Design a protein around this ligand. Structure first.
Ligand SMILES: *c1ccnc(CO)c1
Length: 248
């Protein structure tokens, strides 16, 4: 289970299915935090940084494992500098246990799904081959393991996948019939609620976007305490609940 959460207040420059309204987005992020506030974890909420409109999505700049933290290197050049404004926080939680991705390799942790000590890395336009290769090398160095998953009609691996532990895996789109995931209790996500495929397990609680009944029902019947939070302003920019925090 998890003990720590890291998140970052969204910047006003975030606004630059429509553009997000700052005030509205600020409230949804607050509700997101408050929900996490009930999951028996502490929350380290970082200050907004107007220089990085997308810095609110702290999932990408780093991959926090149980044995080490790995500073990534975003594909988006405008997000690349987000690793430097989070290094110190990571350092404080992982003294002498920090690793990193070096150029020309690129990695965004949003393309990585943790399942026990194995990590599935989606090779995308944001995470190149060299990036995934480096990550896998570091993981296998610390007794962990990793493998690459080619993605076709998806930007981030975690956009259509979410492991909820106990072998339960929410899958949408191209992921439902992939050989690598055939052994998981796959819960297919209807194309109509494909957004809800992005959910986060947090100490037996499952925080999901508000407005997706079928999936919600499915998760509830599985034995999870469901907590739904409205993240409609973040949907407008391909952001889900897994994107807005680091969990370890
Ligand atoms: C989560 C955070 C940022 N971006 C995405 C989709 O690219 C998901």
């Amino acid at each position: 289970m998890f003990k720590h959460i890291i998140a970052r207040t969204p910047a006003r420059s975030l606004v630059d299915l429509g553009k997000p309204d700052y005030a509205k987005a600020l409230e949804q992020h607050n509700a997101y935090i408050r929900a996490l506030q009930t999951c028996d974890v502490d929350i380290t909420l970082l200050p907004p940084d107007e220089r990085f409109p997308d810095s609110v999505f702290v999932e990408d700049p780093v991959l926090c494992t149980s044995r080490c933290a790995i500073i990534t290197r975003p594909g988006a050049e405008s997000r690349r500098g987000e690793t430097e404004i989070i290094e110190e926080t990571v350092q404080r939680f992982y003294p002498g246990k920090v690793e990193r991705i070096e150029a020309p390799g690129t990695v965004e942790a949003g393309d990585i799904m943790m399942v026990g000590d194995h990590f599935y890395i989606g090779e995308s336009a944001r995470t190149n081959a060299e990036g995934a290769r480096q990550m896998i090398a570091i993981l296998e160095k610390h007794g962990l393991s990793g493998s690459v998953v080619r993605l076709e009609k998806v930007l981030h691996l975690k956009t259509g996948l979410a492991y909820l532990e106990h072998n339960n895996l929410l899958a949408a789109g191209e992921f439902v019939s992939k050989p690598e995931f055939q052994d998981f209790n796959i819960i297919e996500i209807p194309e109509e609620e494909s957004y809800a495929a992005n959910c986060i397990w947090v100490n037996e609680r499952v925080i999901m976007p508000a407005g997706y009944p079928r999936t919600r029902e499915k998760i509830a019947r599985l034995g999870y305490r469901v907590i739904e939070v409205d993240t409609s302003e973040y949907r407008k920019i391909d952001g889900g609940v897994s994107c807005m925090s680091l969990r370890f």
